[PDB]
XYZ file of C-alpha atoms in Angstrom:
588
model
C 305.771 131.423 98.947
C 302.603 133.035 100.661
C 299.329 133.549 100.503
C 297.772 135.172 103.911
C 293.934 136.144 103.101
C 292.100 135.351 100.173
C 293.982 131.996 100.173
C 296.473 130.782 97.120
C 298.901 128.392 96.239
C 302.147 127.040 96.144
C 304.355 124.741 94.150
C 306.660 125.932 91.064
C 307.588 123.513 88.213
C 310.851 122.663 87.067
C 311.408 123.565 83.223
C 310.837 120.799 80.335
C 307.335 120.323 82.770
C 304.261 118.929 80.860
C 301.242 120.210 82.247
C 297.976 118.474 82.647
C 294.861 118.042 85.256
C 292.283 120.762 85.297
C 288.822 118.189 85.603
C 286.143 118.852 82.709
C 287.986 121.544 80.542
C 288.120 123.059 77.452
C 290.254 123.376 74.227
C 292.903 120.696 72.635
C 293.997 121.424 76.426
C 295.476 117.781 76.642
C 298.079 119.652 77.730
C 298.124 123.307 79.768
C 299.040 126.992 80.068
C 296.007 127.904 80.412
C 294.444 129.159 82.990
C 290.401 127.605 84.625
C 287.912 129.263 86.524
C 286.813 126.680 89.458
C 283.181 126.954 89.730
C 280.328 127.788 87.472
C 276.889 127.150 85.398
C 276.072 125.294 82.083
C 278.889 126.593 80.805
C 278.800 123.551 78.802
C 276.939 124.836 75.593
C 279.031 125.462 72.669
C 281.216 124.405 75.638
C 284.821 125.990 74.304
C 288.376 126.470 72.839
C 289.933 127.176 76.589
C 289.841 129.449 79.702
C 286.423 128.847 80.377
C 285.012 127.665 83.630
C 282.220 124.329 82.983
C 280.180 122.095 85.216
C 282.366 120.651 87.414
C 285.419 121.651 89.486
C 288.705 120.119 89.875
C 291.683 121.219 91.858
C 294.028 119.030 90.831
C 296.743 118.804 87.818
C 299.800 116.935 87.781
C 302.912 117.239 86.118
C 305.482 115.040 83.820
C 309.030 116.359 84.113
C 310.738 116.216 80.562
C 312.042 112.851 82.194
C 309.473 110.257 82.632
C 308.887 111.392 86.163
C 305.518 112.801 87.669
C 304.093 114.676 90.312
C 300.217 115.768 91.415
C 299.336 118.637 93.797
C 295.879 118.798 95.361
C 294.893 122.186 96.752
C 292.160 120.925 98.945
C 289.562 123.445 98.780
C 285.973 122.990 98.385
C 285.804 126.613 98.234
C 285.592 128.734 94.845
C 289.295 129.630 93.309
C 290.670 129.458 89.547
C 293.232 127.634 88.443
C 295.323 129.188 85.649
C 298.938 128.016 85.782
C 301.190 128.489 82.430
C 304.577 127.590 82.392
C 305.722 130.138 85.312
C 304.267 127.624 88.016
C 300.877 126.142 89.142
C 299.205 128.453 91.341
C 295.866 128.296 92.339
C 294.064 131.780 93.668
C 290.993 131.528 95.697
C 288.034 133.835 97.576
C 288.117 131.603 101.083
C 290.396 130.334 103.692
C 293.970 129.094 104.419
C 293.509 125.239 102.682
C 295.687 122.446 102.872
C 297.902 121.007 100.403
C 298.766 117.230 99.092
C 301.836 116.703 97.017
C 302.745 113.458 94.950
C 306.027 112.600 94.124
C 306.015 108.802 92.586
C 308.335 107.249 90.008
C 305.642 107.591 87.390
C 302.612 109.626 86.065
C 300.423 106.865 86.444
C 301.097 106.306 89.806
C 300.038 109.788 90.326
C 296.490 108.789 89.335
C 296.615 105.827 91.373
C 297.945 108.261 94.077
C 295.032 110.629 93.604
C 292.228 107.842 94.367
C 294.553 106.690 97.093
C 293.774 110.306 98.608
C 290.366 110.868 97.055
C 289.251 107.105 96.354
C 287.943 105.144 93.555
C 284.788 104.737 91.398
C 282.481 102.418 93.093
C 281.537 99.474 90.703
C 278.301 99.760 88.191
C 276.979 96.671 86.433
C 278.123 95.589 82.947
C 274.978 97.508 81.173
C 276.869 100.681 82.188
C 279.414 99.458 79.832
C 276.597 98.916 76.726
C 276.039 101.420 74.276
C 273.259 103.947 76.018
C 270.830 105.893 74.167
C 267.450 108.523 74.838
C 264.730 110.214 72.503
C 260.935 110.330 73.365
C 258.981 111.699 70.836
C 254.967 112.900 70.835
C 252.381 112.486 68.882
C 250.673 109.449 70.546
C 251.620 108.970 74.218
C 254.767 108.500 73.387
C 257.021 106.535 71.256
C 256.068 103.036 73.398
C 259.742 102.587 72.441
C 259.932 101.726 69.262
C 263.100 103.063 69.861
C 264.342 99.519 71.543
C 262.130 97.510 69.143
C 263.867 99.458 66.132
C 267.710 99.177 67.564
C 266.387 95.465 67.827
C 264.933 95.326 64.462
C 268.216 97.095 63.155
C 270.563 94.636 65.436
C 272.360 97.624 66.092
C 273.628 96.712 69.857
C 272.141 98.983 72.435
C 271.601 98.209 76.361
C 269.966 101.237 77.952
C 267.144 103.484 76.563
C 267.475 107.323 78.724
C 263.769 109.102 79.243
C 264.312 112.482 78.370
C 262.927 115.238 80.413
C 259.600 115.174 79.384
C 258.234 112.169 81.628
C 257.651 114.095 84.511
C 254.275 115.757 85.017
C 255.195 119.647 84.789
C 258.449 119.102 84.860
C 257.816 117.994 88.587
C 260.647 115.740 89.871
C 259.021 112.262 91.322
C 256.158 112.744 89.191
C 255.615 111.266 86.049
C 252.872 112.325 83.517
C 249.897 110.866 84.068
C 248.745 111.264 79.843
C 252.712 110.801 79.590
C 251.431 106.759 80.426
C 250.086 107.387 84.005
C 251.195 103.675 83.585
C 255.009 104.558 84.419
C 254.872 102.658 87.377
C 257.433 100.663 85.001
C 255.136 98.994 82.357
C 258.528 98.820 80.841
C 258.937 95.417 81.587
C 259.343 95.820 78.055
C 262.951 97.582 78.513
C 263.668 94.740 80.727
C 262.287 91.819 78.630
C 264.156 93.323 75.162
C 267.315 93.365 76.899
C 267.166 96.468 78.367
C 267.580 98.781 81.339
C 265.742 102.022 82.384
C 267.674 105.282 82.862
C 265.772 108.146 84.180
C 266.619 112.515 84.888
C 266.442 113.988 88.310
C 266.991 117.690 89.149
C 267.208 119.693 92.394
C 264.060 121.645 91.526
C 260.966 121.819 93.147
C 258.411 124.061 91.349
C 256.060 125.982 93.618
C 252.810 124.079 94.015
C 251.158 123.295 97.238
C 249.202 120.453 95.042
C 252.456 118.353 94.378
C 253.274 115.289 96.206
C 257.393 116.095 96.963
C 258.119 119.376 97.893
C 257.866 118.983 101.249
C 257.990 122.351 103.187
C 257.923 120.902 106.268
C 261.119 120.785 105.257
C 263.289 123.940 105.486
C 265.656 122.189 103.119
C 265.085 125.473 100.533
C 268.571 127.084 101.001
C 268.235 130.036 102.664
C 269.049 132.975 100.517
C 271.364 136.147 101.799
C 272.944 135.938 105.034
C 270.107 134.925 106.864
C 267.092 136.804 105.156
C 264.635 134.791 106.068
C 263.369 132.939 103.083
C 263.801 130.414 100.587
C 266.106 131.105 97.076
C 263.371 130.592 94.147
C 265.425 130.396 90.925
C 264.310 129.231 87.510
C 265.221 126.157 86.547
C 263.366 123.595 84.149
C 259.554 124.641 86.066
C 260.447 127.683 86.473
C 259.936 128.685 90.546
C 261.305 125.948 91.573
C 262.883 125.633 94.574
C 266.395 123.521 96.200
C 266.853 121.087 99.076
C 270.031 122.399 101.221
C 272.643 119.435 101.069
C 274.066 122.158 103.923
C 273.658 119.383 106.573
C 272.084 115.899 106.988
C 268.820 116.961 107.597
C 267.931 117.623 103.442
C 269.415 114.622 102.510
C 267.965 112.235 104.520
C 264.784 113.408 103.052
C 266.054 113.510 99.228
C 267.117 109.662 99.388
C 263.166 108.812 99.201
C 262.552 105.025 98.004
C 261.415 106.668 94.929
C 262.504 104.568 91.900
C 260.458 101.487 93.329
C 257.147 103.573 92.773
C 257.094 103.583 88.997
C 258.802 100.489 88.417
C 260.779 98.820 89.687
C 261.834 99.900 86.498
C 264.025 102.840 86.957
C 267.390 101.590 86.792
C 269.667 104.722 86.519
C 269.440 108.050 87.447
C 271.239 110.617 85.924
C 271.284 114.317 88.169
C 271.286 117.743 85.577
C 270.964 120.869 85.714
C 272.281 120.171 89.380
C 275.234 123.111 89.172
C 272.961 124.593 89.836
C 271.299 126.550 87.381
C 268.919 129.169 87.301
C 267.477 130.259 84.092
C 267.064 134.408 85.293
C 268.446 136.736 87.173
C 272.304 137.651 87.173
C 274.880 135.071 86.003
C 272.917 131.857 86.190
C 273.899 130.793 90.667
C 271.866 130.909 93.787
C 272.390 133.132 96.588
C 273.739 132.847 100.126
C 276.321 135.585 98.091
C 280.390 127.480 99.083
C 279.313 126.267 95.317
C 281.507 123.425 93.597
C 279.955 120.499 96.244
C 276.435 121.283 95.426
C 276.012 118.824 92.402
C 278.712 116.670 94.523
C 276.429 116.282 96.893
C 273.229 115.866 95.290
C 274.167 112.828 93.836
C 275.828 110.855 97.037
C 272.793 111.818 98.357
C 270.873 110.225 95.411
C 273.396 107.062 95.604
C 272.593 106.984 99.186
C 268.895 106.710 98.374
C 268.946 104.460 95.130
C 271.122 101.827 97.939
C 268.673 102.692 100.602
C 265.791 101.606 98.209
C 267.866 98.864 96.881
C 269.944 97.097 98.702
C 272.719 95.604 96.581
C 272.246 96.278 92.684
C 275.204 98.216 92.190
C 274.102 101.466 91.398
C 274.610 103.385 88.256
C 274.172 107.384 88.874
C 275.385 110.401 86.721
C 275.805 114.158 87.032
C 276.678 116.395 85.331
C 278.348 118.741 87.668
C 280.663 117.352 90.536
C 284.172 117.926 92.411
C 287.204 116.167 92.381
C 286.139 113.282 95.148
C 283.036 113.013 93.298
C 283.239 109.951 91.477
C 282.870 108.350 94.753
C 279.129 108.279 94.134
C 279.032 109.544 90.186
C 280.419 110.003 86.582
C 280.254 113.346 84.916
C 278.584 112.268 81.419
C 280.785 115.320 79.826
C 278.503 118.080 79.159
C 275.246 118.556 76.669
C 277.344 119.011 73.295
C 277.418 120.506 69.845
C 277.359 118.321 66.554
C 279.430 121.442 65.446
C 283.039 119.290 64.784
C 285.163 120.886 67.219
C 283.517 119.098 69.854
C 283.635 115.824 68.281
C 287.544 116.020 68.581
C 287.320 117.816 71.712
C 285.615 115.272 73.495
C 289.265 113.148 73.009
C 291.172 115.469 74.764
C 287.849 116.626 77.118
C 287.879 112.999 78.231
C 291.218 112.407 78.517
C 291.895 114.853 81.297
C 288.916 113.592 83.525
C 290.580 110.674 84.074
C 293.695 112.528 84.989
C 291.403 114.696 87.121
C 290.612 111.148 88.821
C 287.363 110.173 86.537
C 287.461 107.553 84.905
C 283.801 107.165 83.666
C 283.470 109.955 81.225
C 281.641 110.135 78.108
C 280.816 112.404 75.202
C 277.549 112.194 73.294
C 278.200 111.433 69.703
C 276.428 114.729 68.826
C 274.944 116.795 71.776
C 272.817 119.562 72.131
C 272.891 122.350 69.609
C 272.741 119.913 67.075
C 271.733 119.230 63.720
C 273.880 116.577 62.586
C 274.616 115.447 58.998
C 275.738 111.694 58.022
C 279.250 113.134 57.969
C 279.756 114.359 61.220
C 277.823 111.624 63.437
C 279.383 108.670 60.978
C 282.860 109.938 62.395
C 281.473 110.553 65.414
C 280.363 107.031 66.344
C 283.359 105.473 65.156
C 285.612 106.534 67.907
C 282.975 107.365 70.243
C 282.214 103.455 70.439
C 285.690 103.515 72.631
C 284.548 106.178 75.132
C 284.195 104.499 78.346
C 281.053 105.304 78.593
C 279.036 105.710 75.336
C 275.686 107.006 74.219
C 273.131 109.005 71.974
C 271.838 112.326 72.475
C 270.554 115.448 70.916
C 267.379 117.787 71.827
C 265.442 120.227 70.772
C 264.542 118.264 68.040
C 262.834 118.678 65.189
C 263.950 116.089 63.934
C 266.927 113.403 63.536
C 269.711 112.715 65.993
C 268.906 108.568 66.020
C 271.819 105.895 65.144
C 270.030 105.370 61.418
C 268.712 108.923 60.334
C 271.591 109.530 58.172
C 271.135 106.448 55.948
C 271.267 102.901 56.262
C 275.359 103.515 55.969
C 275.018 105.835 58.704
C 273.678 102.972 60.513
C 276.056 100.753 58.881
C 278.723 102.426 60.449
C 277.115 102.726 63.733
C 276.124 98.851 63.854
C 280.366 98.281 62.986
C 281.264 100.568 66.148
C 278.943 99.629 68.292
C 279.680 95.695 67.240
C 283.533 96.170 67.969
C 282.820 97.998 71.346
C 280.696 95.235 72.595
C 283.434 92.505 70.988
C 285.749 93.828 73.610
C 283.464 94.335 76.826
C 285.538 91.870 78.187
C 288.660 93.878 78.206
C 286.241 97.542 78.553
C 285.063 95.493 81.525
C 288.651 94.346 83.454
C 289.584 98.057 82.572
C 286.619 99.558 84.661
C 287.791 97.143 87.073
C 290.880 98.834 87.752
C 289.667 101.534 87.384
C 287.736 100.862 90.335
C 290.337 98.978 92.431
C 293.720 101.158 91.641
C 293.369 102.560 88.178
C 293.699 105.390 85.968
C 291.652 106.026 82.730
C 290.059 103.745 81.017
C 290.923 105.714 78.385
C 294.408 106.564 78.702
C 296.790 109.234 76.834
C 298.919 108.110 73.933
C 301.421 109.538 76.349
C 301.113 106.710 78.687
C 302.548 104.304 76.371
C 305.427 105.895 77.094
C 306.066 108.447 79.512
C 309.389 109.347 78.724
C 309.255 110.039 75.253
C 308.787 113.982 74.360
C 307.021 113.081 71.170
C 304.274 111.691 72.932
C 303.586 114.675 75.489
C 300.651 116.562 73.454
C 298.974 113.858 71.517
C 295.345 114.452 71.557
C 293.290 112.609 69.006
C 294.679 109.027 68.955
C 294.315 107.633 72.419
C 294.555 104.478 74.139
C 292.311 101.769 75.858
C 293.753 100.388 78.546
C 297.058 99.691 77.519
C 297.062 97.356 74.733
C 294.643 98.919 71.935
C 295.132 102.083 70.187
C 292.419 104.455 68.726
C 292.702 106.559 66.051
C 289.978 108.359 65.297
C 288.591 110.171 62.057
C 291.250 109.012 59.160
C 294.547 106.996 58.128
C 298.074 106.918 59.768
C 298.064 109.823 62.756
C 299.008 111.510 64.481
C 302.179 111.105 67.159
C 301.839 107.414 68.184
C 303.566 105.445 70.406
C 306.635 103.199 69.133
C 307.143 99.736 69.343
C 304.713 96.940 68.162
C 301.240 97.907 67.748
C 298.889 96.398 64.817
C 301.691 94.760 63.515
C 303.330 97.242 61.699
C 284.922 101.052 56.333
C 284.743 105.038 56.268
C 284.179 106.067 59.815
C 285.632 103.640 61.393
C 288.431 104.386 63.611
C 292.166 102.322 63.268
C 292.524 99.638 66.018
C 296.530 98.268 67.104
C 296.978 95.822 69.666
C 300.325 96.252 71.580
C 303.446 93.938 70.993
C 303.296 91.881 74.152
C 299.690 92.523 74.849
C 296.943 89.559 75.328
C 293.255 91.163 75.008
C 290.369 89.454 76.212
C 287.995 89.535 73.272
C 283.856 88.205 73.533
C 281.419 87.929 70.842
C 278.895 90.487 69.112
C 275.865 90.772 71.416
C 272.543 92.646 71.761
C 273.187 93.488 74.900
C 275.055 92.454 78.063
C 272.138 90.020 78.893
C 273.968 87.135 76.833
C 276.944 87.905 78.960
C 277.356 85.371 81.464
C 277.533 83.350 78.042
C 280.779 84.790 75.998
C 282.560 82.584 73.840
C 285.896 84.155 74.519
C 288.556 84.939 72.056
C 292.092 85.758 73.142
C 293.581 88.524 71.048
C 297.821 87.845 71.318
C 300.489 90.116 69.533
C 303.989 88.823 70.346
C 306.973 91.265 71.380
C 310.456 91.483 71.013
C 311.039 88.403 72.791
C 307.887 86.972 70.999
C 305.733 86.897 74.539
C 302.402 88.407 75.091
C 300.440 88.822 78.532
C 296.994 89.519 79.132
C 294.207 89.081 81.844
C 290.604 89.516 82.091
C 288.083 90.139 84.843
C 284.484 89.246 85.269
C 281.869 88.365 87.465
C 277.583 88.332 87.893
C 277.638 91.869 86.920
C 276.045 93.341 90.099
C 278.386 92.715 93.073
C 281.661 94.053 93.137
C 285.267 92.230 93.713
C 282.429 90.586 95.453
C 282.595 90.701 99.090
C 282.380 86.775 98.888
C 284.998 86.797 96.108
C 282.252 85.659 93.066
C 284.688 86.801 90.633
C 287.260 84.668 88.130
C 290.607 86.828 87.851
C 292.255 85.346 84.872
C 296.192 85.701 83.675
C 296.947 85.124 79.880
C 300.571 84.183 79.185
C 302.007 83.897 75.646
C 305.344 82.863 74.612
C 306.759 81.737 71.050
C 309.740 79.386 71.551
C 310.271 77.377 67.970
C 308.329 78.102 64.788
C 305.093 77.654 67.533
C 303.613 79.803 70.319
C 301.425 78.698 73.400
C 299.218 80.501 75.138
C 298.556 79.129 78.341
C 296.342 80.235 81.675
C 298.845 81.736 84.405
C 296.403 82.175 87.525
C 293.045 81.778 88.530
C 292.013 84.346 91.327
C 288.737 83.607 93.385
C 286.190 82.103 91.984
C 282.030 82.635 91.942
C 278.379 82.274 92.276
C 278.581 80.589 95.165
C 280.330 80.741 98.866
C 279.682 81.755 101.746
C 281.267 81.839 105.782
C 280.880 79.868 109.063
């Protein structure tokens, strides 16, 4: 068909079509119908039951033929459309110019992920504390909390890795400036993060406010965006300062200067960065933008900028940066975080199906805070939260505007009973979480995969939204017994908050050892985890390394292949391959 001026869309589906794609979305959209505005604010809130536009834009959806058969178009546009594309064809119809188009047509569905990334690319590799359970809080009434927080989770043995710093640690909400009664003594004293098994994660923003007394906002800069065609003048929205004001990420110029040096000034002690309110958003004036009035990239490329710097600073930890708005290539230098919640309960299942689709919108690093913003929580709803939001891929704690509660063991020590037995299995299987965000990062699709996946061409398990998968092998259900479509075939075989765990028939899972944290790592007494098929066999394989160099460039990695095969009343489980090998080698 056509399309001429404001640009469009092609592509019409054949009928028995399963729709999915869409990026960061709302509703029990696993699957689609619905049409998505591609653009917009913190729109995440009491986010929403579909047709809502939220933090980040993705052009992308894919579809599943009633066969088994699958097929992704990209409408490459950086520009600002809406994608709303029922059963009477995908189209996407958009406010700029003519834009190309990508179609896959590949034997499967999951070779359309793996055909996404091999357009748009992979997730660069973080280190295995990305994969620990990740929590924030700070608190007042003497200069802080000191922690406490990490003593207590200590104290409790309740496994975390990473403690967040919330907000608040800057000096007027002044980005590169800590508070100097907020522990003018930031320049990392948290040796103590490091020394109880910890690592630092710290906000940035994209707003300067307007003080001529600061030590960032550089205007010998010109990176303000310009507002109106021309104008002359700088766009002063009002963000967390108020009249603060934004580098350009127009051209080179802006980020060159944003990638500073800056978390070696503090510490070193700021580990991870997360980017917010980075849309962006303006707290007044009309609808919450900026004006020039392209958007979607904005948050995109704040953060490769802030990847660029963190490796400029750094050379060689693998970094670990998160934003919460981004574009479908993004997760080339970040991973979404999915959107300041509500404790509410439609969110809680939501965040199944939310996730679900940001892997099929190429992201596999999503996560969903067992809570949010908007908040207060009883026992009831975190207790089921936490039990299947242990198997996110990535995991944490949340909540704001506190008065109080929010914390792992507010609602009762069984509250924190059944947060110490999720958090305990999740860490239990960061060998297998691990491989997974391996292949994520070298070919593969979610980390947390659809029911659906299991297998593609059964029609029962189009629209399943609450159960899900890890990686394959283990299935999640979350909040309560027997549903709802699973897959068939071998799976278990055949407490309260706690979600139901099967292992696949022919399935070998790599399996560790309760830890702290992932400093005891390097040290995992490993477990194999074998369910036998219909031929009694079972194969498996796990990957692993240092934790902060990738499929290392010298090959300090261990591939490992699990085989299992009963033949007689007895099975063996044997070691198939060993690929590379590490920590040491080098080249002549």
């Amino acid at each position: 068909s056509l399309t001429d001026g404001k640009a469009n869309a092609s592509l019409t589906v054949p009928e028995g079509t399963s729709i999915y794609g869409g990026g960061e979305v709302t509703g029990s959209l696993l699957r689609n119908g619905k049409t998505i505005k591609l653009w917009n604010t913190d729109s995440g809130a009491y986010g929403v039951d579909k047709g809502t536009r939220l933090y980040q834009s993705h052009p992308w959806m894919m579809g599943v033929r009633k066969d088994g058969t699958a097929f992704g178009i990209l409408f490459d546009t950086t520009w600002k459309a809406e994608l709303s594309s029922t059963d009477e064809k995908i189209e996407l119809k958009s406010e700029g110019i003519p834009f190309r188009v990508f179609i896959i047509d590949r034997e499967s569905p999951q070779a359309v992920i793996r055909g996404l990334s091999e357009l748009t690319g992979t997730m660069p590799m973080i280190p295995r504390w990305a994969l620990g359970y990740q929590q924030c809080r700070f608190s007042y009434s003497p200069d802080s909390r000191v922690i406490e927080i990490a003593d207590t989770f200590r104290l409790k043995r309740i496994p975390c890795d990473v403690i967040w710093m919330d907000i608040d640690y800057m000096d007027g909400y002044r980005i590169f400036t800590f508070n100097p009664k907020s522990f003018p003594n930031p320049k990392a004293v948290n040796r103590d993060l490091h020394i109880r098994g910890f690592h630092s994660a710290w906000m940035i923003d994209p707003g300067a406010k307007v003080d001529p007394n600061y030590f960032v906002y550089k205007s010998g800069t010109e990176n303000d965006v310009w507002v109106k065609t021309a104008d002359g003048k700088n766009f002063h929205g009002d963000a967390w300062p108020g009249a603060a004001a934004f580098p350009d990420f127009t051209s080179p110029k802006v980020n060159k200067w944003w990638r500073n040096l800056y978390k070696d000034f503090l510490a070193q002690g700021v580990d991870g960065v997360w980017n917010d309110v980075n849309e962006p958003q303006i707290n007044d004036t009309p609808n919450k933008t900026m004006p020039e009035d392209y958007h979607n990239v904005y948050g995109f490329l704040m953060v490769k900028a802030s990847r660029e710097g963190i490796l400029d600073a750094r050379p060689e930890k693998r970094p670990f940066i998160l934003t919460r708005s981004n574009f479908l290539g993004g997760q080339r230098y970040a991973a979404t975080w999915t959107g300041d919640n509500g404790s509410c309960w439609d969110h809680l299942k939501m965040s199944v199906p939310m996730s679900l689709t940001l892997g099929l919108s190429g992201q596999p690093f999503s996560g969903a805070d067992i809570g949010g913003f908007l908040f207060n929580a009883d026992a009831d709803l975190f207790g089921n939260w936490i039990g299947f939001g242990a198997f996110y891929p990535f995991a944490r704690g949340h909540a704001c505007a506190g008065t109080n509660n929010k914390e792992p063991w507010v609602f009762g020590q069984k509250v924190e009973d059944a947060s110490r037995i999720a958090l305990e299995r999740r860490y239990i299987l960061l060998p297998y979480f691990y491989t997974l965000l391996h292949e994520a990062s070298t070919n593969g699709m979610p980390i947390m995969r659809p029911v659906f996946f299991s297998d593609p061409k059964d029609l029962s398990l189009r629209a399943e939204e609450e159960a899900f998968l890890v990686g394959d092998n283990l299935l999640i259900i979350p909040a309560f017994a027997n549903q709802p479509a699973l897959p068939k075939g071998i799976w278990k075989e055949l407490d309260k908050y706690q979600a139901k765990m099967k292992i696949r028939g022919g399935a070998i899972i790599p399996t560790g050892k309760i830890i702290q944290n992932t400093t005891e790592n390097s040290l995992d007494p490993l477990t194999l985890l074998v369910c036998l098929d219909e031929q009694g066999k079972a194969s498996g394989n796990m990957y692993w390394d240092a934790g902060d160099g990738w499929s290392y460039k010298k090959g300090d990695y261990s591939l490992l292949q699990f085989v299992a095969e009963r033949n007689g009343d007895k099975v063996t489980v044997k070691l198939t391959k060993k690929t590379g090998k590490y920590n040491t080698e080098n080249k002549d």
